[PDB]
From Swiss-Prot, chain B:
UniProt name for this protein: V-type proton ATPase subunit E 1
Function statement: Subunit of the V1 complex of vacuolar(H+)-ATPase (V-ATPase), a multisubunit enzyme composed of a peripheral complex (V1) that hydrolyzes ATP and a membrane integral complex (V0) that translocates protons. V-ATPase is responsible for acidifying and maintaining the pH of intracellular compartments and in some cell types, is targeted to the plasma membrane, where it is responsible for acidifying the extracellular environment.
Family: Belongs to the V-ATPase E subunit family.
Disulphide bridges: none
Residues of the full protein shown: 9 to 57 of 226
Compartments in which it is found: Apical cell membrane; Cytoplasmic vesicle, Secretory vesicle, Synaptic vesicle membrane; Cytoplasmic vesicle, Clathrin-coated vesicle membrane
Superkingdom of the organism of origin: Eukaryota
Assembly and interaction partners: V-ATPase is a heteromultimeric enzyme made up of two complexes: the ATP-hydrolytic V1 complex and the proton translocation V0 complex. The V1 complex consists of three catalytic AB heterodimers that form a heterohexamer, three peripheral stalks each consisting of EG heterodimers, one central rotor including subunits D and F, and the regulatory subunits C and H. The proton translocation complex V0 consists of the proton transport subunit a, a ring of proteolipid subunits c9c'', rotary subunit d, subunits e and f, and the accessory subunits ATP6AP1/Ac45 and ATP6AP2/PRR.
Residue numbers of Phosphotyrosine PTMs: Y48
Tissue expression notes: Expressed in brain (at protein level).
């Protein structure tokens, strides 16, 4: 029992820290994509302000 | 029994600690990359209109 | 340690919910949910339960913590949510959705459980609060934030059982310090004194890591790095950096030291962190740790970073200013820079610098020090000051510092009496 369940917990531990080396790297790519969705809405808002002034 | 489950929780904690450290050290880089691009483009677009 | 060891019992502490329902202590909705949640076998089957009954889940957990009298049933309920949030951190959003449906912030449903009568209940309540507060879109504020920090500060003040419970308190405090404004609120609670105190109490490597991780998280902000200097934290990290070569402990000190120095946008503060590490002689230990086998780039590259930056302030300290620091710190000794003629022969006049600061230090030490070495060293320092800077005689005579030396001619120590006489010789005899 004991060492087998401990090695399974060690395998889960190794997987959990391996996923931590990936989590924020996916968010760091998506930062480049969220920085397009934010930008088109702002470009549209600034054009609407300009067109209202025109 | 309890000592086995304690060691299992300990070896997963021995990853949880690294995992929190890795999440926290990388947390800033995602925030910087979004903020950098957002400020850069919102300044250009402000001045254009 | 303690929380995992108790949870290994409390996960087996299954409950007769029909008895609490018959006793009217719970609703049929709470009873049915916790029964269905106990029947759903694994984290995916709990995700199906959250997908079908997620608001009723948050309702049930809050109810079964609130309305149950018995501490160990509340700990079982706390253990079940603590594990449910361990399976996926995103699930905190379901409790905030339930709080918003309840026309409330989340915190009033959880903060009352910090008053619970069994220590495991309050620590598990603190884990839930820390998980919500770290991972939520909604954040703690004001009296709620300060109250939970006053609970944390109270548990840190409990100093092996207290120290081993405080591992959970440190983990909860690290979870809090993931959020920026909570760092300022903890510094306003002044709670870094307690972190520094645990590290000053020479705690085990688990607490060394968790407390220095709390300090590393505190050091993420330039405005925090400007302020954190008053806690005297670089010496306790530098002690652990010598006393504890453990891979995690090594890495989190290097991380804390890198954050303090690199986030100091103020050049004076940057120089001061680099120099405080050099007054702790950290750079030599970083070279020892560069030669030691480590498999981690987050050790190796932060060693080389600090070796470069402390590679500036080593040049500042290794001046004659190793004497300046021995005066500033009050570490007067028969050191090589006190003993060597070259220093005085080239620099003795500098005792007048910063509006006579070094003279004022030596005078104060000759006035109020208990240590005959310090007194004799200071008398020797006065002897060489007058020997190598003749106007220094007039300055000691104008400051009246001679009176201390002339009194210490009858000091209880022959080393002091000798150095006092020798200073009187160098003061009055050509």
């Amino acid at each position: 029992q004991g060492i087998q369940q401990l090695l399974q917990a060690e395998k889960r531990a190794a997987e959990k820290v391996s996923e931590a080396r990936k989590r924020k790297n996916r968010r760091l790519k998506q930062a480049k994509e969220e920085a397009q969705a934010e930008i088109e809405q702002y470009r549209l808002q600034r054009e609407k302000e300009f067109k209202a002034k025109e | 029994q309890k000592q086995i489950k304690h060691m299992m929780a300990f070896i997963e904690q021995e990853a949880n600690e690294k995992a929190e450290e890795i999440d926290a050290k990388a947390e800033e880089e995602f925030n910087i990359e979004k903020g950098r691009l957002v400020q850069t483009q919102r300044l250009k677009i402000m001045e254009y209109y | 340690n303690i929380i995992a060891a108790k949870a290994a019992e409390v996960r087996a502490n299954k409950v007769n919910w029909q008895s609490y329902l018959q006793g009217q202590m719970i609703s049929a909705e709470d009873c049915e949910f916790i029964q269905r949640f106990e029947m759903k076998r694994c984290s995916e089957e709990k995700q199906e339960m959250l997908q079908t009954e997620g608001s009723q889940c948050a309702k049930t957990f809050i109810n079964l913590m609130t309305h149950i009298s018995k501490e160990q049933t509340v700990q079982y309920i706390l253990t079940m949510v603590d594990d449910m949030l361990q399976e996926n951190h995103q699930r905190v959003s379901i409790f905030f959705d339930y709080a918003k449906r309840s026309k409330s912030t989340a915190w009033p449903y959880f903060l009352p459980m910090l008053n619970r009568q069994d220590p495991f209940t309050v620590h598990m309540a603190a884990r839930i609060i820390a998980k919500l507060a770290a991972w939520g879109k909604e954040l703690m504020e004001g009296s709620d934030l300060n109250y939970y920090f006053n609970w944390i500060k109270t548990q840190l003040s409990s100093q092996s059982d207290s120290s081993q419970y405080v591992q959970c308190v440190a983990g909860c405090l690290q979870l809090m310090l993931r959020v920026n404004e909570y760092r300022f609120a903890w510094v306003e609670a002044d709670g870094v004194n307690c972190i520094m105190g645990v590290l000053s109490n020479k705690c085990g490597f688990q607490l060394q890591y968790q407390m220095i991780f709390s300090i590393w998280l505190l050091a993420f902000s330039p405005q925090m790095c400007e302020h954190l200097r008053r806690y005297n934290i670089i010496p306790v990290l530098s002690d652990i950096l010598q006393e504890s070569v453990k891979e995690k402990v090594t890495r989190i000190i290097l991380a804390a030291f890198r954050n303090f120095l690199e986030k100091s946008t103020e050049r004076e503060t940057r120089q001061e962190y680099a120099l405080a590490m050099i007054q702790c002689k950290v750079l030599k230990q970083l070279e020892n740790l560069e030669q030691q086998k480590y498999d981690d780039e987050d050790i190796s590259e932060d060693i080389k970073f600090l070796l470069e930056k402390l590679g500036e302030s080593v040049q500042d300290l290794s001046s004659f200013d190793e004497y300046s620091s021995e005066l500033k710190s009050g570490r007067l000794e028969w050191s090589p820079v006190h003993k060597s003629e070259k220093f005085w022969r080239e620099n003795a006049v500098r005792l007048n610098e910063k509006n006579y600061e070094l003279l004022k230090i030596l005078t104060k030490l000759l006035e109020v020090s208990d240590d005959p070495q310090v007194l004799a060293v200071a008398a020797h320092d006065v002897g060489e000051y007058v020997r190598h800077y003749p106007r220094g005689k007039r300055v000691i005579e104008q400051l009246g510092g001679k009176q201390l030396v002339m009194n210490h001619m009858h000091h209880e120590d022959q080393q002091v009496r000798y150095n006092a006489l020798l200073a009187v010789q160098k003061l009055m005899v050509h």
